């Protein structure tokens, strides 16, 4: 799990250190449209979910898989926004859409110890 | 040009599935069935299909879903907030369709105004 | 339609190659060889390029391998065959291209209606 | 590796038909029952398989869809004729997926040479 | 097709700016602002963005840094060795979008050989 | 990997090879020169997102007289463009790269 929390935050830093002016405003607007508007942010969790199933990237997909979980999202509503994913995607996200379940559980078995 | 796009969705997804196969209709009442009422409303799912239809660049598809978005009744400031996500993680590849959504939603936002039928 | 098409394609095929490179030429030679018969026919080639041209959705070139499968001997039967499996693998976004592909098929199959 | 691939794959298949809904189940059927024999040979079926997802880039789907190649006796030269076409369509990007379709290619011809079960 | 794609864009862009959010504005601007020159002349960028949106087949794109190229002094010699590379990498799916960029190019050397605005 | 292309041309046909040629050929210096026909590639691999393909070009380029921040400058084109979900492979990418200035320092080849 946080294998990649700190794969993350340190390779998150650097490249914001290393970096420019115009990628630091990127990733101020990266995390910006996802913050609460007209549209809940468990809902924005779970478009950036989805578009990120679509474009199968399978580090976005666990960062938002976390944040919907962090926003009270149930599985139901994780697996019914991935079904939509799947769909329009394809059958080659389904290798993604496999490791995002397996994400998933490992992560609920955290909420059970704490 | 609204009026374009739906007759011949209707049109040419008849004739895909009359020469189509049992797999051919059943992918596309697929496509159809994973938007419906669960624990996330239609709004919600039907704004989904418009970040994924638009992170993947499909016009066609993105005028779909903004129709769909417009029933349910979706603000222009919930799809604009959806749009925005798009474009955000698919880059500004994205905006020639980010352009033509908005023209489409203005013409689907005119006909509701003057009371006319869009579904 | 479908001249429009062609002497689109060829013209600014010539056009490309033209103000084009040696590497461009090559490459040009390389889409069109790789479709030579071999262990495989020609058929299942072209078949497999409207495969490929119809997951990454592209118009064009769905055209070009379409008319290619008929005037192979495929069938609307064997050509949609091959569809359905980019439908399943691209998913629902290819959706509009599938569209497209059986209108232009269909004028095809309409155009040997007199040869 | 080829062991692990069957397994994790069959496993987190079936997680996720578990976890998920009618619609999830109902996709992947359609995923296998669209290689199915039909006006045209399942080794044609696969094959083409192999090409879309070499051009999409998509490992796993390229590994499962070689077993299923040789499963079904396509021969390697069959299958690089199949997937010359997917890299020059694809271009360079996926080069780097051709090298592992290869070392896994050949691992599958290796575990058929000691007659040992490919499914 | 010329007047025509950029009396659109130009209006399209407007129309999506009011009707957008502060998000869009911001995103908008970073497009713009990434192609300035740095350590990287702007010529080298904009044929970095049209290696991109060509390998990434998005016509739009393509014909926008198209123009931007030759405002900027690129040969049709820089132009095409850049295509060549979206080319190779992007794969032969992208030959319906080098037809299209390479008719539109000429259109756009013909307004200039008559100072005609870009 | 250097190794694997040659399983791969080895096992290959007469087009595999030829396909890996213009590969090879399409980044030699002409009009434009080979320090941005690199930093091309860079840019062209990170929108497509290919990190095989964005780590030999980072070598080529770091070994080609480019800097870290004429580097940059192409990866900043390319997160644009192709968005946020290249933001993982932006990171890969950041972190090779130093790892190749925490070596060329101490005076190494780059293949």
Same mark, same amino acid.
């Given at each position: 799990?946080?294998?990649?929390?700190?794969?993350? =935050?340190?390779?998150?830093?650097?490249?914001?250190?290393? @970096?420019?002016?115009?990628?630091?405003? +990127?990733?101020? &607007? $990266?995390? /910006?449209?996802?913050?609460?508007?007209?549209?809940?942010?468990?809902?924005?969790?779970?478009?950036?979910?989805?578009?990120?199933?679509?474009?199968?990237?399978?580090?976005?997909? =666990?960062?938002?898989?976390?944040?919907?979980?962090?926003? @009270?999202?149930?599985?139901?509503?994780? +697996?019914?926004? &991935? $079904?939509? /994913?799947?769909?329009?995607?394809?059958?080659?996200?389904?290798?993604?859409?496999?490791?995002?379940?397996?994400?998933?559980?490992?992560?609920?078995?955290?909420?059970?110890?704490?």
């Amino acid at each position: 799990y946080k294998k990649f929390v700190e794969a993350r =935050r340190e390779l998150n830093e650097k490249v914001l250190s290393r @970096g420019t002016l115009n990628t630091k405003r +990127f990733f101020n &607007l $990266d995390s /910006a449209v996802y913050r609460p508007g007209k549209l809940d942010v468990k809902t924005k969790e779970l478009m950036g979910l989805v578009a990120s199933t679509v474009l199968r990237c399978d580090d976005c997909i =666990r960062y938002h898989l976390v944040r919907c979980v962090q926003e @009270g999202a149930s599985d139901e509503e994780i +697996f019914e926004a &991935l $079904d939509i /994913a799947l769909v329009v995607g394809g059958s080659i996200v389904i290798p993604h859409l496999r490791r995002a379940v397996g994400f998933l559980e490992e992560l609920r078995e955290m909420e059970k110890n704490g």
